[PDB]
């Protein structure tokens, strides 16, 4: 009961279904690894290293493209330093230094693109003050950016005209991206793709269900954060915040099928920080020895593992240092194995 | 501080005035009306071409073509009468969250989680669709899009703002700010002069597209709302909220008139839409079945069933002659 013209339309729809089925088969070899963790934990740095080890996509122009962000970083860090200085009401020893603050305080961070001799001289003179040094030594309260020591000791290497950022430097810049960043790559005929959800500031309930049935969750926790408190609220523990997030994550039904792996980071700072601070002061429960990295690491890992409501999920862990390159090269090789075997595809097995 | 108490006093003034206006309820007037009775509905067609859960679809003005958006990074156009497929188009940013169809039949708008709503030119030489304008600038995550003509488009995202864009120029023209939560849904009036937007603060707002100032604010719900849609005549609108109690508000009297509620339901609301005549309200539930409620009496009239997961979207054709449903199963179903 048809005509002799719609048969072309039927042929077209048949050939479009035949086109769709190829993409159907094509999209059965991917494993999305959803990354999570609170701020400043280091979520982006993993993606960056990851890009370096396999993609190897960095080029001289791409490295150059970050200079502006480098300047922005150095200025925002320094401005935070001045704000912290004036917050704690600490007297200055040099009169010129007091004047040198007005010229650097009310500066639009975004507009600045290059240096002249004035800003270099200002920063050099400001850094010399032992008041700034002691304020840096008291960086507990005001939560200054962690990666400020590297830049503030090498300002002259940036002040030159022929500036090319090096491979080491680029791994510490923080690039402002609001949208989620997705990085696909392929190893051994398996395409991995991972996403980042640290850039969204709106309510979580609305967009979370869009992530149903992800294969794996990779949680990231910072070790050195444990002793940071905030003036605004009389009691403030960054650890408790991350613990509350972790407790919330496992109670959503959306992720019951997915396995949970929790990485720890910043172990190096931890081994350079415990030498004059006592964990027992912060947490009464601890009773072991002092000046011990092993005891604190074991305690933290034990407590996170113990904070599992279901008690039927075997959560794994590793200790890594974010800046290093061989450590990640080995830990990711480990996780590949221990995740690929524990994953299966049904394929009409009922 | 005195500003806060003055605001409280103005709130008391507006409350007492609106209370004074309300004389009688709708139920008392609507006692002497013959009921609808019992209506059943049958499945006439099953369109199946996706590999993932469906988020949005929209009818065409022609009343024959429909466009559906899925998570597979591909959105496809279906012909409703004979189920065949005309245009399957891939899109780059694989996390989509809304679709929209041009009244002219030349464009298709899609938006998502990457904050870039890419407009697609359909009718072109060489017979391959291409991206026309990579409209950008908004921050957060887009939630919906509705054409007003072949040029102006309204957008709403998670930045607590509504923005009007021009496709040719590519830059913002007017911002409708003033919310505090997050905007969820849009709905254009038939005359294309006024739209209302509901926020996550349990508050609706009516906007004037010309002047750019919020004409009227509507409080009343106790939780976030999810769907808004105008009465066909353009004098009232219905709202669906997570408390499961849909509600109706008229513009002229500036107060709520009638509430739908029942005890056996506790789930949220995904979609709401009147019919062409105006006496029926199709609502969509999480209990896997959508319900048809009569407008003026608050009784039920039947059930549509057939799905395994929640119903994500509804669509009523301009002729009031068919209803499409899209649910999280990669299936679309047309009811008559």
């Amino acid at each position, epitope marked *: *009961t048809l*005509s*002799a*013209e719609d048969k*072309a*339309a039927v*042929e*077209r729809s048949k*050939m479009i279904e035949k086109q769709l089925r190829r993409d159907k088969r094509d999209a059965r070899r991917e494993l999305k690894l959803l990354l999570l963790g609170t701020g400043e934990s280091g979520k982006s740095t993993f993606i960056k290293q990851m890009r370096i080890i396999h993609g190897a996509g960095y080029s001289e122009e791409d490295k150059r493209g970050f200079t502006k962000l480098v300047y922005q970083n150095i200025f925002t860090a320094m401005q935070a330093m001045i704000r912290a200085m004036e917050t704690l009401k600490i007297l200055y020893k040099y009169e010129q230094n007091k004047a040198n603050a007005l010229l650097i305080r009310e500066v639009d961070v975004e507009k600045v693109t290059t240096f002249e001799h004035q800003y270099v001289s200002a920063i050099k003179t400001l850094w010399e003050d032992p008041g700034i040094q002691e304020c840096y030594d008291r960086r507990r309260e005001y939560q200054l950016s962690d990666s400020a020591k590297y830049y503030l000791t090498d300002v002259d290497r940036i002040a030159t005209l022929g500036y090319l950022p090096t491979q080491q430097d680029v791994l510490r810049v923080r690039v402002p991206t609001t949208g989620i960043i997705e990085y696909p790559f392929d190893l051994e005929n398996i395409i991995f793709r991972m996403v980042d959800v640290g850039g969204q500031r709106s309510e979580r309930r609305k967009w979370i269900h869009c992530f149903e049935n992800v294969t794996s969750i990779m949680f990231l926790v910072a070790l050195s954060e444990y002793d940071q408190v905030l003036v605004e609220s009389d009691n403030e523990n960054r650890m408790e915040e991350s613990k509350a997030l972790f407790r919330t994550i496992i109670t959503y039904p959306w992720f019951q099928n997915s396995s949970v792996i929790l990485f720890l980071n910043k172990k190096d700072l931890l081994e350079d920080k415990i030498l004059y601070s006592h964990l027992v002061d912060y947490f009464p429960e601890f009773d072991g020895p002092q000046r011990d990295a092993q005891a604190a690491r074991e305690f933290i890992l034990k407590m996170f593992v113990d904070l599992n409501p279901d008690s039927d999920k075997i959560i794994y862990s590793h200790f890594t240092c974010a800046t290093d390159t061989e450590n990640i090269r080995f830990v990711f090789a480990a996780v590949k194995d221990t995740i690929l075997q524990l994953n299966l595809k049904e394929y009409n097995l009922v | 501080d005195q500003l806060r108490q003055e605001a409280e006093q103005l709130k008391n003034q507006i409350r007492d005035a609106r209370k004074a206006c309300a004389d009688a309820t709708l139920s008392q007037i609507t006692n002497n009306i013959d009921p609808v009775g019992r209506i059943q509905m049958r499945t006439r067609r099953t369109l199946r071409g996706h590999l993932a859960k469906i988020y949005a679809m929209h009818w065409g003005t022609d009343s024959r*073509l429909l466009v559906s958006a899925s998570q597979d990074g591909k959105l496809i156009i279906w*012909d409703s009468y004979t189920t065949n497929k*005309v245009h399957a188009i891939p899109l780059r940013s694989s996390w989509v969250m809304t679709c929209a169809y041009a009244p002219s039949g030349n464009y298709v708008a899609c938006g998502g989680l990457d904050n870039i709503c890419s407009i697609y030119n359909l009718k072109t*030489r*060489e*017979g*391959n669709v291409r991206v026309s304008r990579e409209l950008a600038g908004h921050t957060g995550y887009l939630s919906c899009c509705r054409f007003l003509d072949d040029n102006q488009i309204v957008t709403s995202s998670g930045d607590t703002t509504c923005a009007l864009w021009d496709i040719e120029t590519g830059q913002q023209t007017t911002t409708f700010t003033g919310h505090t939560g997050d905007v969820m849904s849009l709905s254009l009036a038939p005359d294309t002069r006024l739209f209302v937007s509901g926020a996550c603060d349990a508050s609706a707002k009516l906007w004037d597209v010309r002047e750019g100032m919020c004409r009227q604010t509507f409080t009343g719900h106790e939780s976030d709302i999810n769907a808004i849609c105008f009465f066909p005549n353009g004098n009232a609108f219905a709202t669906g909220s997570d408390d499961a109690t849909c509600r109706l508000f008229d513009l002229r009297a500036d107060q709520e008139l009638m509430t739908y509620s029942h005890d056996n339901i506790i789930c949220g609301i995904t979609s709401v839409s009147f019919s062409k005549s105006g006496r029926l309200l199709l609502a969509g539930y999480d209990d896997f079945n959508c319900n048809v409620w009569d407008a003026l009496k608050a009784d039920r009239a039947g059930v549509l069933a057939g799905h395994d997961n929640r119903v994500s979207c509804l669509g009523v054709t301009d002729d009031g002659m068919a209803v499409a449903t899209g649910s999280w199963d990669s299936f679309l179903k047309i009811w008559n």
Partner: single-chain antibody
Amino acid sequence: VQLVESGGGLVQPGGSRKLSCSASGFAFSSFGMHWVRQAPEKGLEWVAYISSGSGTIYYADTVKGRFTISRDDPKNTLFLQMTSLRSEDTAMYYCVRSIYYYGSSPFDFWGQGTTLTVSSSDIVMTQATSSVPVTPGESVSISCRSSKSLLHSNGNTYLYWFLQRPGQSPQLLIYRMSNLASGVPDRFSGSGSGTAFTLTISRLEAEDVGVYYCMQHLEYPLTFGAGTKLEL
């Protein structure tokens, strides 16, 4: 947006002859092509047709078993092989284009064409008039009868209307008896009853003179009509 052919010259009876139609500038993979004959002293005649992806091939009855067309999509070409050419095969050959879905307009764009010389039922349409002395400044009416009710159950009528300026290639004017192809001024408009369709050129302008061609597409093999020649 350009189609160029080759393979023109002289051939001897009892041989072989390849003809090539190129294609540059579009998504060639999804365009069903045709072939069109034009005798130097008569109207038009359908030759053959290839579908998309070689899923369908048709032929005119008068030529079955002598020709063959193959499409090479990776390099975007189209070959027609002829064997045992007869004396009546001298003509002008046109390569065309056509896409079939809902609301699209087939026969948009026509090739330049190649000449070929040699040495040594089905729905029939009709034309009621030949010469028409034009009157600039007024309206003109052209008519075409048929031999079958071209109306179908779906409610559309598969009659078309062409134009061919002298020394050029024909372009589409009216498709499906009511619409107009995008690229023509709005003066044209066709109205007709089921038996007969008429076109009404309102307010004639200079350089509009051309030989017209009624064409139907109900069922293959689609044929043409002799048409009318405007003169002044």
